[PDB]
Ligand binder design. Structure first.
Ligand code: NAG
Ligand code: NAG
Lengths: 106, 49
């Protein structure tokens, strides 16, 4: 651990279209084992259903293309990359030291 | 839909070891490292000029 550092940040929610399925001609979100999945839907009545943990069947939305399930992790932090969506609010969670720094020798 | 992006410039991680430093130089001072031999007596000294 020399002087240099980078920032580890709270990751943003990552959309996963595999969670959303069409069970009975109605959409169904099956979050992975022990993981929340915020479901945002724009059919008749906007759905902002966050706290689902096991399975939830939405019959208002009849198409998979009009619902989006975002996996929620909020436990392991990520590098402040520009190819990842930014999480809302303050996200700076720590500093990661940079190894293999440039050093003097012969 | 909207996307907000911002960028900034910071020092590189290797700036502690790989950096040029800009000085202002003036009023030079001269020193000499003289062997002086007087009357078979020899000495090595540093003399400000
Ligand atoms: C499937 C599963 O693990 N569920 C648990 C349950 O205690 C609850 O749904 C939640 C608390 O909000 O924590 C998680
Ligand atoms: C001056 O002094 C140094 C001190 O060791 C010595 O090595 C050198 O030979 C001396 N020079 C002369 C010309 O005597």
């Amino acid at each position: 651990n020399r002087g240099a550092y980078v920032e580890m940040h709270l990751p943003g929610s990552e959309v996963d279209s595999s969670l959303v399925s069409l069970s009975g001609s109605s959409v169904t979100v099956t979050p992975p084992d022990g993981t929340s999945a915020l479901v945002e839907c724009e059919c008749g009545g906007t759905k902002i259903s966050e706290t689902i943990n096991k399975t939830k069947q939405f019959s208002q939305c009849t198409k998979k293309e009009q619902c989006r399930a975002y996996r929620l992790q909020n436990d392991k932090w990520v590098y402040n990359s520009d190819k990842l969506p930014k999480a809302a609010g303050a996200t700076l969670k720590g500093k990661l030291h940079v190894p293999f720094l440039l050093a003097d020798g012969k | 839909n909207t996307q907000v992006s911002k960028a900034y410039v910071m020092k590189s991680d290797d700036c502690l070891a790989d950096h040029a430093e800009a000085y202002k130089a003036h009023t030079a001072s001269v020193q000499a490292f003289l062997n002086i031999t007087v009357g078979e007596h020899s000495i090595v000294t540093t003399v400000y000029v």
